[PDB]
């Protein structure tokens, strides 16, 4: 048993809810919250800016030190950093950004990072402002992630369609 409430069960291991990932993280304090990161860990908007704002910019301060030491992530890659006041850990995962021209095939690689964690609270990778179709992102998630993932979908209308079209 765990603390996640009101999720629809899609598969053995994937659950979904219409919710802001920030409000869910603040209420649940999960072991792992996933950030929809970019390779520079510049958290300006979308899930990254919302999460970073909720940490009072501590996520960005920590991220800038990570980049100064290690250099940028890969598209499809990830790093584990603090979850600050939201979670124990934040898994920063870089899905491909269609609005920058990146290979959508890298979305599977991105979701493979989730398999290193038994339970995660996550957004739909590469969806929202990253330009991919969230229906596609959900399908790749279900077909790639084997650990237990609780997906928070901010947008009510896209959430309604993601459920109603799920195969
Ligand atoms: C346009 O539709 C969208 C966009 C997104 C991405 N996203 C953005 N900011 C949030 N605070 C989220 N929490 C869950 N997902 C979040 O979700 N649905």
UniProtKB/Swiss-Prot annotation:
User: What functional role does this protein have?
Assistant: Responsible for the cleavages located at the N-terminus of the replicase polyprotein. Participates together with nsp4 in the assembly of virally-induced cytoplasmic double-membrane vesicles necessary for viral replication. Antagonizes innate immune induction of type I interferon by blocking the phosphorylation, dimerization and subsequent nuclear translocation of host IRF3. Also prevents host NF-kappa-B signaling. In addition, PL-PRO possesses a deubiquitinating/deISGylating activity and processes both 'Lys-48'- and 'Lys-63'-linked polyubiquitin chains from cellular substrates.
Q: Could you read off the lineage of the organism from its UniProt record? A: Viruses, Riboviria, Orthornavirae, Pisuviricota, Pisoniviricetes
Q: What is this protein called?
A: Papain-like protease nsp3
| Residues in coiled coil | none
Regulation of protein activity: Inhibited in vitro by GRL-0617.
Q: List residues of the Macro domain.
A: 1-167
Effect caused by changing residue 164 to L: In strain: Gamma/P.1
Q: Which reaction does it catalyse?
A: Thiol-dependent hydrolysis of ester, thioester, amide, peptide and isopeptide bonds formed by the C-terminal Gly of ubiquitin (a 76-residue protein attached to proteins as an intracellular targeting signal)
The lineage's top-level taxon is: Viruses
- Write out the annotated subcellular location: Host endoplasmic reticulum membrane
What assembly does the database describe for this protein? May form homohexamers. Interacts with N protein.
Membrane topology recorded in Swiss-Prot or TrEMBL = Multi-pass membrane protein
